[PDB]
Structure formats: C-alpha cells, structure tokens
From a paper:
Here we report on the galactomannan degradation machinery of the common human gut bacterium Bacteroides ovatus, with a focus on the extracellular, cell attached β-mannanase BoMan26B for which we here solve the crystal structure. As for other GH26 β-mannanases with determined structures, BoMan26B has a (β/α)8-barrel fold with an additional N-terminal α-helix and the two catalytic residues (predicted acid/base Glu-201 and nucleophile Glu-291 (50)) located in a cleft. Extracellular BoMan26B initially cleaves galactomannan into shorter oligosaccharides, which are transported into the periplasm by the SusC-like transporter.
To investigate the structural basis for the galactose side-group tolerance of BoMan26B, and the biochemical differences observed with BoMan26A, two crystal structures of BoMan26B were obtained: an apoenzyme structure and a structure containing the saccharide 63-α-d-galactosyl-mannotetraose (G1M4) in the active-site cleft. The two structures are very similar, 297 Cα atoms align with 0.148 Å root mean square deviation (RMSD), using PyMOL. A calcium ion was modeled with 0.5 occupancy in the apoenzyme structure coordinated by Ser-108, Leu-105, and Glu-179 and three water molecules with a binding geometry typically seen for calcium. BoMan26B contains a potential calcium-binding site and was 100% stable over 24 h at 37 °C in the presence of 1 mm calcium, but it lost about 40% activity when it was not included. A surface view of BoMan26A and BoMan26B reveals a more open active-site cleft in BoMan26B, with five subsites on the glycone side, whereas the BoMan26A cleft is narrower and restricted by loops 2 and 8, resulting in only two glycone-binding subsites. The longer and more open active-site cleft in BoMan26B correlates with its preference for longer substrates and production of a range of oligosaccharide products.
Residue numbers in the entry: 37 to 361
C-alpha cells in the first residue's frame, strides 16, 4: 500500500514532532486525505474559522504565508507574534506555511512583489555572492529563519512549501531550472545552518518538470496547485503523473480553487495526501462582517466543504491524533 513511500525526512535529526507528523501522513497515504485552508493573505486562521461556521468541522491543516517579510514587524503584520500559529497547534491542528517571496519592484523601490510581470528582480544576480540582489535575499533568509526558529523553539513543526510553482515561469524564481534549483538549495542550506530541524519540505511541481526538481536531499513531499479544473478524471490524471514521477513521496493538492468535489476526485483515484483551498479575500478578511456568514466563496463554497466532510476518507481537525509530548 504505502511501502514505496520513504520513511524518513530528508533532514537528519528532524524534531520529534516533525517525524510524528510525517509518519502520520505516510500512514494515511492511500487511505485518507487531510483537509486544509489557507490564511486570509498571511497570518491568521480566518478561513479555518469560516469553514467551521459553514460545516461544524475545522480543517486539519492551517497554512500561513511569510510573504510580508518586508513590512514585518508592523502594526498590521508581525511574524514575531507567533500566538496565532501556537494557538492552532495547541488546539490540535497541523501547521503549514508557504512564502510568496516579495522583492523590490525595481532597484531602491519601496514596493515589493513576486511576479515576473511586477518585479525586475533577477535571480541570476541574486545568486552571485556580494551583489545587491544577493545581499537582499541573504537578509530575507536571515529574517525568515529567525521567525521559523521561534516556532522550532516551541516544538512546532511546519509543513513548509516555499518557492512554489517554479516551472510555470510566472514568479521571479521561475526564470530557469538551473538557477531555481540553486536557490532552493541555498534556502535549505541556510536553514540547516540556522538549526531548523522542524520542517517538512514540500516541492510544488507543475507536472513534467523534473529538470526543476531540487533533489531528494532537499524535498520530502510533492505538491500540485490547481485552479479551475472541474474534471475529476483530469485531477486523477495529474495525481497519477506525479505519483509516477516521484514514487517514493506523498503527493498533495497543495492549492486548489474551483475544482471537482472531493467525492468525485476520490472516486476517480486522486488520493491526495491533503487538499488546501485558497482564500477568498473579501469573504474572510473580517470575521465580524456580514459577508462572513453567507456561504459563497470564490474557491470552495459551503456546499463544496460539506461535501468534502461528508466523505469517509477526509480528515478534519478533531480526527487527528496528538502530535505533542
Ligand atoms: Ca522585515
Ligand atoms: Cl473538527
């Protein structure tokens, strides 16, 4: 059943909690699919709260985004304030994080973006020791490693998914496979130097992009991000292709929106390790606003989520075992 999936994380001496989380996911492979929601933008669990108000159940995994490194610390975003992550973990939920790596729109700008169409930041220069771009990404990694170390010191592991969708060539890190792989290894080695042993590394594949794969030494789980795909058969075809490319690794639907209901996906063979719905900015940015209660959602509405939780294979937060002690 799951004998092909690797038993060990790529990180030597990974934390007890990271190993427990990974081992649980490995045990679920082919049998269960975890539910997950994205934060509203970055640093909250507003979509998890929204899902509970629609269904009575919470998602198993809450994901956060370190996108706003340039502004942190600020009145409105401070990644040193880890209570929102701590509180989720202590309520028994799993913690995930991604990272829209925002860089100056142009040299000396005060605007920060991540799409190639919105920044001229050049990864090839960022990898050359001593350049302006290199100093920028080193300082970002130092700041980010410090924020992640706050979670490590609280014994909170993170299902960590940086540098995603590289081969789509729409983010500044998607210029070319060779420089992309060098950047992934720099992030990994920088974090290793900082002592971050609480991370499970998720590499997001666009399918048929093996030239972009950073390597077994730097990756634990494969992710796929899919929007606007309502053929469950097509979703299963993607799932199968990823399983074939990476037969030793769990495969997750790490982002989705406007996709076939989970019952159809599962019946077609798309047996993802988890699915994470993207956020609807206007609906969940304010949990006190009337729109919070309506049930409509750009990515997965009330009916979609009640369908998902109606399926035997789908895990909610209260289904999870304990990952602490
Ligand atoms: Ca900062
Ligand atoms: Cl629950």
């Amino acid at each position: 059943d799951n004998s092909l999936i690797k038993k060990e994380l790529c990180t030597e001496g990974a934390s007890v909690e990271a190993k427990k989380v990974y081992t649980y996911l490995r045990n679920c492979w082919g049998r269960k699919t975890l539910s997950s929601t994205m934060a509203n933008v970055t640093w909250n669990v507003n979509e998890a709260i929204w899902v509970n108000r629609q269904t009575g159940k919470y998602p198993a995994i809450a994901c956060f985004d370190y996108m706003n490194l340039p502004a942190s610390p600020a009145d409105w975003i401070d990644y040193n304030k880890i209570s929102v992550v701590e509180d989720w973990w202590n309520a028994g939920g799993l913690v995930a994080a991604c990272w829209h790596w925002n860089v100056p729109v142009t040299e000396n700008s005060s605007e920060y973006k991540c799409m190639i169409s919105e920044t001229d930041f050049d990864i090839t220069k960022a990898l050359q020791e001593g350049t302006r771009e290199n100093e920028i990404i080193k300082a970002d990694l130092e700041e980010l490693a410090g924020y992640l170390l706050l979670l490590k010191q609280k014994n909170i592991p993170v299902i960590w998914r940086p540098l995603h969708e590289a081969a789509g060539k729409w983010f500044w890190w998607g210029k070319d496979a060779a420089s992309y792989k060098r950047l992934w290894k720099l992030v990994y080695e920088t974090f290793k130097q900082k002592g971050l042993n609480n991370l499970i590394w998720v590499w997001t594949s666009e399918t048929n992009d093996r030239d972009w794969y950073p390597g077994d030494a730097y990756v634990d789980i494969i992710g796929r991000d899919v929007y606007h795909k309502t053929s469950a058969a097509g979703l299963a075809t993607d799932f199968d292709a990823l399983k074939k490319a990476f037969p030793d690794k769990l495969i997750a639907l790490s982002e989705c929106g406007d996709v076939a209901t989970i019952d159809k996906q599962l019946a077609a063979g798309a047996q993802w390790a988890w699915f994470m719905t993207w956020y609807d900015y206007e609906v969940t940015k304010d949990t006190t606003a009337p729109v919070f209660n309506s049930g409509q959602h750009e990515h997965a509405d009330k009916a979609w989520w009640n369908n998902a939780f109606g399926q035997p294979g789908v895990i909610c937060r209260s289904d999870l075992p304990s990952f602490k002690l």
